[PDB]
Design a binder for this molecule. Structure first.
Ligand code: 0HZ
Ligand code: 0HZ
Ligand code: CA
Ligand code: CA
Ligand code: CA
Ligand code: CA
Lengths: 199, 199
């Protein structure tokens, strides 16, 4: 029946983070920075556009629940103004597109809440989750879920291949995208899962 | 409490077409040609990149059913090779984006079967349905449905505004896109519906 497709660091649990609400500002291992508009610098600091992992643990000040999975989430934060472009995470998989298969891609998407000393996390940039083969977006969920301040929700993306799909044999891939359509312009992702089932 | 947002020629019934499977090759009334990659020329023939309306009535060569709604559908056909770009239909509405409102866009999407002038309609280019405010895509369904050869299915796109949405007061819009990701690379749309409801 259903087969689980392996993904590296699928719940962003590497690296380990000791202190609740702490976070890194480098690309998490197993992933790459999707950067089509060059918004995220090679060298990041507290003060730049950045991505990384963050510990959403007991006593977090910024959510009304914990990480969907384990300790950590993956986040993308953009400093540039709304409409400047998009960025996020990308992972190309070893699995290839096979014919007469239903693919289901699930990812949790989180909306950071609250304030800190004049800083405000109110609002949300929009998200898109993409399933790729090669560099083709086969299917994507472009911001269809409403995500309340301080909660996560599961996005579901589906593609069904045919006997004669043009992209057959190409490497499957995943992209988790910050749309930068409004601010606060950070968002969190967690618990990436991909399954495949013969139609 | 649910309110219908008016759309012009929402079912592509204008213009009336007398003979089953006959069609126009010009932009349907009430719509514009979405053409970001310049795939569709200003003057069209049968078999050039084009769009139009077609009559899907009793004894159509292309479906196992009649049009989702009334007589007609709106089609977009792209002659160029896969990867060349996208094109379709756009309509800017008079309604504007309002706060704390749940928007639901539904569109029927058709995978043509059969044969036409000795060409197989086997295969499908992929679709995307978009809800806009101004020139921003608020939410979109990028090709998540599996549509069998010779059937229509309903795409649903949803967006929820907040009190402080950046695009509040901007004009709502709809785009119906042919993705040109595979061949046969034409597809049909019908029965565009958009509703709004206070959250
Ligand atoms: N879940 C995230 N995306 N990141 C971790 C929580 C927010 C993160 N940690 C903090 O302590 C607050 C201080 C204000 C800025 N913050 C941050 O950027
Ligand atoms: N699309 C329909 N259901 N009916 C109209 C068929 C004709 C319409 N116009 C054309 O020029 C041909 C090109 C190939 C596909 N076409 C079309 O879809
Ligand atoms: Ca996790
Ligand atoms: Ca927020
Ligand atoms: Ca119709
Ligand atoms: Ca077909």
């Amino acid at each position: 029946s259903v087969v689980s497709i392996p993904i590296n660091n699928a719940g962003f649990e590497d690296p380990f983070i000791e202190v609740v609400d702490d976070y890194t500002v480098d690309t998490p291992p197993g992933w790459t920075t999707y950067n089509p508009n060059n918004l995220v610098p090679e060298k990041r600091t507290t003060w730049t556009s950045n991505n990384g992992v963050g510990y959403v643990g007991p006593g977090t000040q910024f959510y009304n629940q914990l990480a969907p999975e384990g300790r950590n989430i993956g986040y993308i934060y953009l400093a540039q103004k709304p409409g400047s472009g998009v960025a996020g995470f990308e992972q190309i998989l070893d699995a290839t597109l096979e014919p007469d298969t239903n693919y289901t891609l699930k990812v949790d998407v989180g909306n950071l809440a609250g304030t800190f000393k004049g800083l405000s996390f109110a609002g949300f940039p929009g998200y898109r989750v993409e399933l790729l083969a090669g560099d083709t977006v086969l299917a994507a969920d472009h911001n269809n879920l409403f995500i309340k301040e301080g909660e996560f929700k599961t996005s579901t993306v589906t593609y069904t291949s045919t006997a004669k799909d043009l992209h057959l044999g190409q490497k499957l891939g995943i992209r988790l995208v910050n749309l930068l359509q409004d601010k606060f312009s950070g968002l969190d992702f967690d618990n990436v899962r991909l399954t495949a089932e013969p139609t």
